Amino acid sequence: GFSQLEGLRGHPSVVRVIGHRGARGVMPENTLEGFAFTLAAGVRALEFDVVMTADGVPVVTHNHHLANAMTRDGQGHWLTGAERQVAEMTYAEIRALDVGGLDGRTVYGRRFPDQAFLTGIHVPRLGELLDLCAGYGDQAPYLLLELKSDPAHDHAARAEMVAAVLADVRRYRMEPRTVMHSFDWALLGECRRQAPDLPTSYLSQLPEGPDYDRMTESLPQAVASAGGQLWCPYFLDVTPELVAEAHDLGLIVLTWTVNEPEDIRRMATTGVDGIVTDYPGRTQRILIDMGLSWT
Amino acid sequence: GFSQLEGLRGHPSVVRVIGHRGARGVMPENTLEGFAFTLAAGVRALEFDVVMTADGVPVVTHNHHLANAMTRDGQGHWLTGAERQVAEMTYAEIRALDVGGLDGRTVYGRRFPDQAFLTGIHVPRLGELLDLCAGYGDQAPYLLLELKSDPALMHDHAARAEMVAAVLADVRRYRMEPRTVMHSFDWALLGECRRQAPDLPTSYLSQLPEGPDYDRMTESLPQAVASAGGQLWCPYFLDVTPELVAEAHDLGLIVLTWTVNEPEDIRRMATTGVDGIVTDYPGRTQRILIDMGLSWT
Ligand SMILES: [Cl-]
Ligand SMILES: [Cl-]
Ligand SMILES: [Cl-]
Ligand SMILES: [Cl-]
Ligand SMILES: [Cl-]
Ligand SMILES: [Mg+2]
Ligand SMILES: [Mg+2]
Ligand SMILES: [Mg+2]
Fold first, then answer.
1. DSSP assignments along B104-168, one per residue
2. How many A-B residue pairs are in contact by the CB < 8 A criterion?
3. Regarding the domain delimited by B1-297, which CATH topology (the fold level of the hierarchy) does it fall under?
4. Which end of chain B has fewer surrounding CB within 10 Å, N or C?
5. Å from B27 to nearest chain A CA?
6. What topology does CATH give the domain A1-295?
7. Where are the domains of chain A?
């Protein structure tokens, strides 16, 4: 089947640990430095986000607009004013910016007060991250590659994005580690069209994507029927019964983004295959305490 | 004229950040893995501990006995029973153990619940740490090298001198003199360091019971340290007051306080005017300094 799933499939005593944006709680998110830390912490699977620049470069960042809370200019000053769209910026323009730390006077910055504060850190190209990962050979981590389609609907552009992402995955020969992951289920269908050998992972989050109000099948049922290999529900949306239903349909379930100790502990007991977390060490330690492992 | 002090001296815009055992809140303490992480997190100074094995190897571990909360046997199970004395073990025997994580059931484990949990990590030789540090070249960190004497040698003056010589042989082999500071609670040992290596500054740890006879002494800690010939005074943070810090600065000393982890303590120490803060949480400390408009370079 899909050998990429071997790093994400759980067992009775095994719950996988996936580093969210690398390890946002410890290092600046979606940075090569953060990803290197995460792998050095023994984490075997990484989640990260891919968006496209104006000049067709896949880059690793979560927001479609560069957030003032996260971004400094070449002078070292936090950006102010309009948050600029990644889609309207060339790579070169993005590269001049610094995403090495957070502004501790902002609500977002105050969420992650223990994160290191680095300077002169660039938004990476997807190719840079893949090249890094490929160098580790058989120890390359599993990649939950979150595709973020430009919300400003053009199928041509969406197909171009998927094609650009795949060109990088293939260039670095990361097919055996790569999972295409998204809230955009139509985009996942396009992933499957251009890359039938890469598994697809379906993100879900209940309100308060599918029409959560009108749908008559369960989320796991909908994912299986769409052709997905993974169902990734927000952790407040998980029950042991829903996990069991997904497993009966042959799906792998990874939940996110679980950071509080009581929430990690609770999720580990539900049977989820793995936990996406901003705090991989914290998660490792809770799993060990419960007699579980992640390798 | 000690060039090593350039990375430990503060100034109006700067409070130095010293990584305690690397970054014990994030990575297993006193490990090459944790030291590399610390340097990748932009920390420019490291504190770590050195103890002698039975076969005369300076190794990087915090105490003269091995703690059950951070040590696993050759099968992977936590040590139980009486602590083992490092001076009575060969380096090979020590190396057979695993120090890659902490036992989360324990008091000590609960102190650092977010530390990564690694397997297959052994206690490194001092030489290995110095090789790693020297590899960064001009970006090599400043080193606050804590000599941890074993009270069993307290009447073995030759053995104590041998410890100092062994540590220095390593420092010299890796050309780390320009970054090394000799640091200890054992003030007599610091006298021996100065005699064997007058080129390396000496740093005097203190911690009040509430070393010297804290109940008997009549001069201040800063005065006692300046009089002993030290360049740094490193008091435990609960013992620090701004008046004691200014008294120390007036005597020409650098003041590094330790081990400061809670946000309100980090902030209060920055405000006393200390030259630097030794912390288990360098990122937390960095963020508080940035919030205060300060930096660590
Ligand atoms: Cl493919
Ligand atoms: Cl978030
Ligand atoms: Cl420095
Ligand atoms: Cl205990
Ligand atoms: Cl301690
Ligand atoms: Mg994401
Ligand atoms: Mg300026
Ligand atoms: Mg120490």
1. TTSHHHHHSTTS---SS--PPBHHHHHHHHHTTGGGPPEEEEEE---GGGTT-HHHHHHHHHHHH
2. 76
3. TIM Barrel (3.20.20)
4. N
5. 8
6. TIM Barrel (3.20.20)
7. 1-295
